[PDB]
Ligand binder design. Structure first.
Ligand code: CU
Ligand code: CU
Ligand code: ZN
Ligand code: ZN
Lengths: 153, 153
């Protein structure tokens, strides 16, 4: 019934964090946790396809996209399953993560278990930037920290 | 039909490694990769229940054991699903991992995706030691390095 997961974000720089996930049956996934070391403002935050840290965050591949859609914000019909929009860091570099999402899951075809969470250098423009890169990544830029999403007690 | 997984092992000390997994249909899981920084000799090697690195390797919990059995070697009827026996390092501290196992899986109820691989301080006694500890851990001792098992391309 109740499924839990966890993700420790690490990178080459100062950004680090711990993300928690909970899903009750086929309900929304509730995403919580804290990221530190960020620049003030909005940072893209997505599930990427592969739980592969062999080349740091690069080997996580693109956004998780089992329905073969273009990039959007989490409220858009046209989005990747992994598209969880932006987290916001305050003056102190701390982002408090508080997201509910209906497309990701912790079981079945939409499961993010064994995939990667990434937090980016720049704001995700939610697919509205009017260049091709917007339709793939939201122009969120480099991957500051990432972690493989694991099963939690 | 074909599933691939990967696991990057890290710890507090010098031990590191990369583990690859492949499962074609309901063939066995073929486990490969390299572990470095080990003392010469045998080191226990298991799937632990939780993909939780919030407290290093400690938070991975016990050996993955959905059938509530006693610890064993991979050839024993009585084993944990996660029991993959020992890997061996020579004088260079390098273990070349080469294992085939039919109880672990990369999908379904016995999936190890999102769980943790651990490499240990000591030899796994394969549950043959005459004490309670053998029946839980194989007397494999401390957890030198671990990582969350992720979905690979
Ligand atoms: Cu991303
Ligand atoms: Cu172990
Ligand atoms: Zn996207
Ligand atoms: Zn065991």
């Amino acid at each position: 019934m109740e499924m839990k997961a966890v993700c420790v974000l690490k990178g080459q720089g100062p950004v680090e964090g711990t993300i928690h996930f909970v899903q009750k049956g086929s309900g929304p996934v509730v995403v919580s946790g804290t990221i530190t070391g960020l620049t003030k403002g909005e940072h893209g935050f997505h599930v990427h396809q592969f739980g592969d840290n062999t080349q740091g965050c690069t080997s996580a591949g693109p956004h998780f996209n089992p329905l073969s859609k273009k990039h959007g914000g989490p409220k858009d019909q046209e989005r990747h399953v992994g598209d969880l929009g932006n987290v916001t860091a305050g003056k102190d570099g701390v982002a408090i993560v508080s997201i509910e999402d209906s497309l990701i899951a912790l079981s079945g075809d939409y499961s993010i278990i064994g995939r990667t969470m990434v937090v980016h250098e720049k704001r995700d423009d939610l697919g509205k930037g009017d260049n091709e890169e917007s339709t793939q990544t939201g122009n969120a830029g480099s991957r500051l920290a990432c972690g493989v999403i694991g099963i939690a007690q």
